């Protein structure tokens with residue numbers, strides 16, 4: 312009874328650093344090494360997909376110094392994952408990102424595209440509204456060019472047009488104590504089981520992941 | 535603790551645990567389902583007193599058709615009690631969901647309940663009845679496609695604000711979602727509308743859900759308020 316697709320809201324990094332008396336940048340430096348560790352663990356448990364929320368469409372509203380740091384820091388994707396054995400995809404609006412980050416992201420996707428193990432989907436400049444809106448625009452355009460009728464518009468069509476693809480998350484884990492999805496995968500989370508923990512992302516370990524999975528299994532047996 | 539000055543404007547409710555409550559008392563499932571609207575009305579009365587403006591209650595999902603035909607027929611017949619429960623209550627009632635696939639008598643009862651309570655100035659109860667999140671997004675999308683092909687809007691008018699206006703469940707979106715019964719999912723309830731909603735899950739079965747449990751959800755919500 313292992314979940315095939317886990318979604319992760321990787322919250323608590325800033326709080327982790329501030330509570331420790333560290334610069335906020337120190338919390339953020341743990342983001343990808345921690346995600347990489349979670350991928351290795353999950354891969355060995357048989358988990359096939361992880362979709363991880365790294366930067367929302369709202370996070371542009373953060374302090375420019377933190378946003379610039381993050382945007383620079385995200386360029387380390389390639390070193391972290393290029394030779395890790397994980398298949399990496401990024402979802403979200405890539406064209407807002409600095410061109411060098413766009414290049415770095417394309418490079419990571421390209422070099423890992425033939426990896427056969429765990430598929431890691433990183434949501435970067437992503438929001439559920441915006442996923443649904445781009446899909447809708449795509450459906451309207453196809454209707455406007457005679458490629459589809461109004462009767463063709465169904466769940467399956469949306470599933471094809473959305474950025475985060477089937478199969479949908481079985482389990483969502485959010486670190487950092489808040490019980491919200493914060494405009495992550497709205498359509499895709501319709502039947503996903505939620506697990507919320509006060510544990511901050513940089514403290515989230517193997518034992519924390521196993522507790523979440525155990526909790527999912529019990530809930531799956533019940534429901 | 536309960537801050538009168540920070541009530542959520544909008545609570546969404548997933549009213550689960552009615553069937554399991556019946557089996558725990560030895561009773562037939564029908565006995566569980568018959569506490570649904572009386573409990574919902576009680577929740578409305580408590581909420582009105584606290585100053586809550588809107589409740590959206592998940593009564594029947596688009597996937598609940600797949601249940602035992604006995605249970606489905608019983609519910610549809612029972613949903614007719616909506617008029618007796620609410621017509622004289624001071625609550626303003628609206629239904630969302632695909633109304634045309636319900637039995638005809640239920641459709642006229644819904645229309646009558648909406649018409650007789652539309653003048654009420656208090657709490658607005660939105661009953662989600664044959665509703666789903668997929669459904670709401672798809673019907674909005676079909677409506678936007680219709681307008682597009684008739685020259686009434688351009689692809690670049692398609693944005694969050696437009697979508698808010700085409701969906702059946704409207705702004706303001708739920709501040710807080712309470713789900714009774716112990717499952718920790720949203721089960722295709724108000725998907726778009728739950729993007730920032732605080733979730734509260736309890737093992738308490740819906741028929742046992744009371745004023746203390748509700749105030750507990752709200753205090754929790756008040757403790758997590760930010761932005």
Ligand SMILES: CC(C)=CCSP(=O)(O)OP(=O)(O)O
Pocket residue numbers: 320321322364365366367368369370489491493
């Ligand atoms: C991007 C991640 C991991 C979480 C969202 S932080 P939040 O709950 O404050 O929501 P926002 O993205 O800041 O609007």
